[PDB]
Symmetry: C2
Subunit: 362 residues, 2 copies
């Protein structure tokens, strides 16, 4: 009755530690990952302090080693000050994250010249991912070409963006992309229900035509990734709502529902949650690691999933068919039927495994 | 000084056992694979007897288990009689092989309707690969669409074929392809030297414009695979030369030379010899498995490589930069500097590993 899947990978999560641990920490965020059938996560650098230099990465690595319940890699973040300074630690990171749109954070880049500097100085064999919306996609693609290397575009959300990427792929350009579940399963039609606080996310929810274009262009999507971005309900409904949705616990049930409806195949899902994450980010296999899912059980998403400290979900009320029943991680039962059974600290930094270093010429 | 690579995969080898063991057997062919930095091979079904039914597959599996030195999967072959009969054994095979052009073998299909029957009856979640040259590529793509599934095109050799595949990918069609080293590193310009016997291969050597088009369209190539097709020199130079070249021992040195010249990157190589083979064929990781190569050593390909029983090579006289120094397979030293150190029978059928079954809906 159960379907065995390999260990799934989410290349885009915000786990809030250090410095935002009321929103989530490594222990709670990785519990949510395991409950969502995810055994490896790549954590974004917009923490407090942000992971923009070697001391901050060293702290984050120890916090993750002590708190993570699944395996992980940590991104470095590009800043206005750190181009040319990350060479000694770069290979220990998941990749470099460029935040190219609106942020108040120390990740703000004020000029395309700063993007060029990062593309020129970051080691050429290591991943670069970008938060790049609308015309920014075209702009960062131009920088990538000028510097003759690849780029991965995070959370593609619009017809405009997926068609631009499609055209770049048709020209043989080295660009990959990911799409998040909210941009496949929610739209403007849902803003009335969510309200303007809860509904706040970047990239914003798309029109129905945006959603339909992402589905029609599934072939262009290399990865699914949650952009798990936990904030509490008080923050989402307060005066200055921060953008982002929690998503680890709902991503796989939503996508399994689509598989059951024939909207994409099981293989299409596994390419996008396993094989393509591995190959774009050079992430190693996990021995003795698998996920068992039940595809027959129908349930309704509640007002909050059990594990994320966000303690809310924008998918409340959607009917899904697909449940995570058991997760085994490196030979140990990590999750069964609503209970996480590996402690904080069971998870490891995959970039420290011999098989997890990115291959490079001498 | 040495570069560590993951265990490379060759999805297209002819190992001649059962029934052609003067040309190669599992033990000699897998020794050649290991010496070429390959730790997993997918063996084609055009043996004697051909692997076209369950009894023949059972024999071949035991011969491979007893003789193979690296890990493997075995293809089933489509025949004019076996559509609808392979369902119980299909999941144990690498995939189904369709030989769509000229053959005298029991793999000859005489009608496109027989291709349709195979596409309709072979389990939809399992791989199908085709030997399809020139217009046959377009024809089998049509059959795939009619049956709404994917296909993988073997040894793409021509500008015509790579551009057709490029156009299909631009339309979002589920097609992947592989290219063999002889179609990247040899051309018509080499037929004078090779002669009409040794030079016989299918698909035939291309023009210089064919070769240049494959390089220019590297983005369209999903995999490299040798089409290792050993025949003895007596056969190649005799009255009725069979088509095919040996290639396991020369593939990686040729491609490492191209990497050293900047013609493609190390990552481009590893996508095509590791990640994409894994994901197209659902081949499992190999624990504690890696290849160490030396990129500085220049050498000239001799008149025959050490291991293949073909005892000749069409690349004789080419200068290469790139050598396999050490192979470790599942924790054991399998090859060092010209000596194979695992015995016949060390290799295993990866389709019998729990992680090597192709995932499917219940
Ligand atoms: Zn983002
Ligand atoms: Zn991302
Ligand atoms: Zn994000
Ligand atoms: Zn890799
Ligand atoms: Zn062939
Ligand atoms: Zn092939
Ligand atoms: Zn062949
Ligand atoms: Zn797979």
């Amino acid at each position: 009755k159960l379907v065995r899947l390999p260990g799934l990978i989410d290349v885009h999560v915000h786990l809030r530690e250090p410095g935002g641990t009321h929103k989530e920490d490594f222990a709670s965020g990785t519990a949510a990952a395991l409950a969502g059938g995810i055994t490896m996560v790549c954590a974004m650098p917009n923490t407090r302090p942000p992971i923009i230099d070697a001391p901050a990465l060293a702290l984050a690595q120890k916090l993750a080693e002590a708190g993570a319940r699944c395996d992980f890699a940590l991104f470095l973040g590009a800043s206005s000050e750190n181009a040319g300074t990350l060479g000694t630690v770069a290979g220990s990171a998941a990749g470099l994250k460029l935040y190219l749109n609106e942020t108040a954070s120390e990740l703000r880049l004020d000029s395309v010249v700063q993007w060029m500097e990062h593309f020129e100085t970051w080691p050429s064999h290591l991943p670069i991912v970008a938060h790049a919306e609308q015309q920014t996609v075209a702009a960062v693609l131009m920088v990538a070409q000028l510097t003759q290397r690849s780029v991965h575009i995070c959370h593609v959300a619009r017809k405009e963006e997926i068609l631009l990427i499609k055209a770049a792929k048709a020209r043989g350009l080295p660009v990959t992309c990911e799409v998040a579940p909210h941009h496949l399963f929610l739209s403007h039609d849902d803003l009335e229900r969510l309200g303007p606080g809860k509904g706040e996310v970047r990239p914003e929810l798309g029109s129905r035509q945006d959603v339909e274009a992402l589905w029609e262009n599934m072939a262009v999507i290399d990865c699914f990734a949650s952009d798990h971005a936990p904030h509490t309900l008080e923050e989402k409904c307060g005066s200055r709502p921060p953008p982002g949705f929690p998503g680890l616990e709902t991503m796989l049930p939503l996508l399994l529902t689509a598989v059951s409806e024939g909207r994409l195949s099981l293989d299409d899902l596994l390419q996008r949650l396993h094989h393509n994450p591995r190959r774009i980010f050079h992430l190693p296999p996990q021995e003795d690691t698998y996920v068992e899912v039940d595809l027959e059980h129908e349930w309704t998403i509640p007002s909050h999933m059990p594990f994320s400290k966000a303690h809310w979900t924008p998918f409340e009320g959607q009917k899904v068919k697909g449940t995570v029943r058991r997760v085994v991680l490196r030979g140990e039962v990590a999750y069964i039927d609503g209970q996480v059974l590996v402690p904080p600290g069971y998870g490891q930094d995959v970039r420290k495994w011999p098989q997890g270093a990115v291959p490079q010429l001498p």
